Amino acid sequence: GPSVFLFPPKPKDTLMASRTPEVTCVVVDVSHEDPEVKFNWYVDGVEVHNAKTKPREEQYNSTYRVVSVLTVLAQDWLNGKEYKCKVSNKALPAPIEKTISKAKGQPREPQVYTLPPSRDELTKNQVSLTCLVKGFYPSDIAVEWESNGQPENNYKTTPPVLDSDGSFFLYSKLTVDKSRWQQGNVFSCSVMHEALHNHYTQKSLSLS
Amino acid sequence: GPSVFLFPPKPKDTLMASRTPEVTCVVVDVSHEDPEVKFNWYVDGVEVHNAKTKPREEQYNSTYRVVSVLTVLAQDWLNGKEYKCKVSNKALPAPIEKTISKAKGQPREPQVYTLPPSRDELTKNQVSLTCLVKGFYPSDIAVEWESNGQPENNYKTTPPVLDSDGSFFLYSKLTVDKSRWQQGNVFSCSVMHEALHNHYTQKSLSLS
Ligand SMILES: *[C@H]1O[C@H](CO[C@@H]2O[C@@H](C)[C@@H](O)[C@@H](O)[C@@H]2O)[C@@H](O[C@@H]2O[C@H](CO)[C@@H](O[C@@H]3O[C@H](CO[C@H]4O[C@H](CO)[C@@H](O)[C@H](O)[C@@H]4O[C@@H]4O[C@H](CO)[C@@H](O)[C@H](O)[C@H]4NC(C)=O)[C@@H](O)[C@H](O[C@H]4O[C@H](CO)[C@@H](O)[C@H](O)[C@@H]4O[C@@H]4O[C@H](CO)[C@@H](O)[C@H](O)[C@H]4NC(C)=O)[C@@H]3O)[C@H](O)[C@H]2NC(C)=O)[C@H](O)[C@H]1NC(C)=O
Ligand SMILES: *[C@@H]1O[C@H](CO[C@@H]2O[C@@H](C)[C@@H](O)[C@@H](O)[C@@H]2O)[C@@H](O)[C@H](O)[C@H]1NC(C)=O
The missing domain is CATH 2.60.40.10 (Immunoglobulins)
Structure with a gap:
C-alpha cells in the first residue's frame, strides 16, 4: 500500500540555543476507506507520546498525506538518540518502522x-x-x-x-x-x- | 511490479574524441514467473536496432536486476536527441517508455x-x-x-x-x-x- 519517509531536524535547529528542532514523519499514498493512520513515536526504543500529528491532508492525488512531527531536544539529537516512527494502517499487513538518528x-x-x-x-x-x-x-x-x-x-x-x-x-x-x-x-x-x-x-x- | 531507471552517458564520453558514450536502461525488482524482459530502443522516435541488452544479473534481496546498454553517437547526444528505452515484462499491465535527453x-x-x-x-x-x-x-x-x-x-x-x-x-x-x-x-x-x-x-x- 502506502510509503513512508522520515526527516531529520535541520542542522541549525539542533545547534543553536532557543530553537525548535523536530524530526518529521511523513506518509504518502494512503487508502481512502482506510484513512485511520496511527503513529507511534519511540526514543531509543522508549515510546514518547509528546508528539503532534497535524491533521490528515486531502491531496489532489485522492490520497491523504498525513504528517506527524516530534519536537525533540537538541541535546537528544546530538547525544544520538534513535527516533523511530511506527505507522499503522489497514492497507498494511504489518506496520512501517523507519528509524533515524x-x-x-x-x-x-x-x-x-x-x-x-x-x-x-x-x-x-x-x-x-x-x-x-x-x-x-x-x-x-x-x-x-x-x-x-x-x-x-x-x-x-x-x-x-x-x-x-x-x-x-x-x-x-x-x-x-x-x-x-x-x-x-x-x-x-x-x-x-x-x-x-x-x-x-x-x-x-x-x-x- | 517492476521499476525502471534510465541513465545518461558520462560527460567525458561525449566530449572527448575516441570515447564510447552509452545510455543505460536498468530494470529492477524483476521476478521469476514472467522474467523474460524485452527492450525496444527508439531514438528521437525513429527506432534503433544497434542496441545491446548485455546478459542477466541476479541480486541480493531476492529481487532482480536487468541492464541493457545502447552505445550512442556522442555528437548525437550533444545535438539534443531523445533516447527512449522501451521495456516489455509480463508482470507489467503495459510496457514502459522512459525517456532521457x-x-x-x-x-x-x-x-x-x-x-x-x-x-x-x-x-x-x-x-x-x-x-x-x-x-x-x-x-x-x-x-x-x-x-x-x-x-x-x-x-x-x-x-x-x-x-x-x-x-x-x-x-x-x-x-x-x-x-x-x-x-x-x-x-x-x-x-x-x-x-x-x-x-x-x-x-x-x-x-x-
Ligand atoms: C533490492 O536491492 C536492489 C539494489 O539496490 C540496493 O542494494 C542493496 C545492496 C542496498 O544498498 C539497498 O539499499 C538497495 O536495495 C534494489 O534496486 C534498487 O532500486 C531502487 C529503486 O527501486 C534504486 O533507487 C534509485 O536509484 C537511481 C539511480 O541509480 C544509480 O545510482 C545509484 C545511486 O544513486 C546506484 O546505486 C545505482 O547502481 C545506479 O548507478 C548508476 O547507473 C548508471 C548506469 O549503470 C551509471 O552509469 C552511473 O554511474 C550510476 N550512478 C551511480 C553509481 O551513482 C535514482 O535515479 C532513483 O531516484 C529517482 O527515482 C526515484 C523514484 O524511485 C525518486 O524518488 C528520486 O527522486 C529520483 O527521481 C528522479 O529524479 C530525477 C532528477 O534527478 C528526474 O529526472 C526523474 O524524473 C525522477 N525519476 C523518477 C521518479 O522516475 C533511485 O534513487 C536503486 O538504485 C537500485 N539499486 C541498485 C544499486 O541498482 C531493489 O529494488 C531492492 N528491492 C527492493 C526491496 O525494493
Ligand atoms: C500523490 O499526491 C500526493 C500529494 O502531492 C500534492 O498533491 C499533488 C497532486 C500535487 O499538487 C503536489 O505538488 C502536492 O505536493 C503526493 O504526496 C504523493 O506522492 C502522490 N503519489 C504519487 C507517488 O504519485
Whole structure:
C-alpha cells in the first residue's frame, strides 16, 4: 500500500540555543476507506507520546498525506538518540518502522578558510568570495555569509562532500559587485557545527 | 511490479574524441514467473536496432536486476536527441517508455579560476588547492587535476550547483604535501565541457 519517509531536524535547529528542532514523519499514498493512520513515536526504543500529528491532508492525488512531527531536544539529537516512527494502517499487513538518528562516528572540527577572488576574475563586474570548510564529521552543518553585522543575499553553498579521509568538506560561494570588494569591505563566513566551540565560528575576508 | 531507471552517458564520453558514450536502461525488482524482459530502443522516435541488452544479473534481496546498454553517437547526444528505452515484462499491465535527453537550453562557457590555499592553512602539513569552475550550462562536465603530465590522486570535486542566474558552478579540491607547494611545482585544473574550444581548457596554479 502506502510509503513512508522520515526527516531529520535541520542542522541549525539542533545547534543553536532557543530553537525548535523536530524530526518529521511523513506518509504518502494512503487508502481512502482506510484513512485511520496511527503513529507511534519511540526514543531509543522508549515510546514518547509528546508528539503532534497535524491533521490528515486531502491531496489532489485522492490520497491523504498525513504528517506527524516530534519536537525533540537538541541535546537528544546530538547525544544520538534513535527516533523511530511506527505507522499503522489497514492497507498494511504489518506496520512501517523507519528509524533515524544523527550519523554515528567521531565528530570532527571543521577547518574554515576564506579565499578571495582570482586575480583573473577582476576583469568582471562581480567577484567571487570563497569559503572552504573541511575535515568535519558528521555532515550536518550550516554556513552563512554576512558583512558588517548584516546578512548577504547572493551566496550558494555546495552540499557536503565525502573527502578521502572519511571527513566532509564543502565550499560556499559569495558573490559581490567588484566595487564592494575593492572598497576594502569586510565579509564574514559563518559556520555552525557540533564540534565547534559554542557551535559557532566565523572568518573575515578582506582585501589588503 | 517492476521499476525502471534510465541513465545518461558520462560527460567525458561525449566530449572527448575516441570515447564510447552509452545510455543505460536498468530494470529492477524483476521476478521469476514472467522474467523474460524485452527492450525496444527508439531514438528521437525513429527506432534503433544497434542496441545491446548485455546478459542477466541476479541480486541480493531476492529481487532482480536487468541492464541493457545502447552505445550512442556522442555528437548525437550533444545535438539534443531523445533516447527512449522501451521495456516489455509480463508482470507489467503495459510496457514502459522512459525517456532521457541532454538538458535543453543555450550551452554556456565555464569560467575557471584556480585559488591558492589560505595563508592560515600553511600552518598545516598538507594544503588545499582550489579550482572554481562557474557559469557553465548544462551541468554535464568533467574536472581533473595534474602536474608534469601525470594526473593527481588526492582530489575530490563537488557536484554542479545551480547558481542564482540559472548557471552551474562547482569546486574541486586538490590536496598535496605542503612541501610540494613550497618547491613551487605547477598544478593544473583541467575542465572538459561542451561549450569550450575543443571541449577542453586548463588553468595553472603556482606559488607567488
Ligand atoms: C533490492 O536491492 C536492489 C539494489 O539496490 C540496493 O542494494 C542493496 C545492496 C542496498 O544498498 C539497498 O539499499 C538497495 O536495495 C534494489 O534496486 C534498487 O532500486 C531502487 C529503486 O527501486 C534504486 O533507487 C534509485 O536509484 C537511481 C539511480 O541509480 C544509480 O545510482 C545509484 C545511486 O544513486 C546506484 O546505486 C545505482 O547502481 C545506479 O548507478 C548508476 O547507473 C548508471 C548506469 O549503470 C551509471 O552509469 C552511473 O554511474 C550510476 N550512478 C551511480 C553509481 O551513482 C535514482 O535515479 C532513483 O531516484 C529517482 O527515482 C526515484 C523514484 O524511485 C525518486 O524518488 C528520486 O527522486 C529520483 O527521481 C528522479 O529524479 C530525477 C532528477 O534527478 C528526474 O529526472 C526523474 O524524473 C525522477 N525519476 C523518477 C521518479 O522516475 C533511485 O534513487 C536503486 O538504485 C537500485 N539499486 C541498485 C544499486 O541498482 C531493489 O529494488 C531492492 N528491492 C527492493 C526491496 O525494493
Ligand atoms: C500523490 O499526491 C500526493 C500529494 O502531492 C500534492 O498533491 C499533488 C497532486 C500535487 O499538487 C503536489 O505538488 C502536492 O505536493 C503526493 O504526496 C504523493 O506522492 C502522490 N503519489 C504519487 C507517488 O504519485
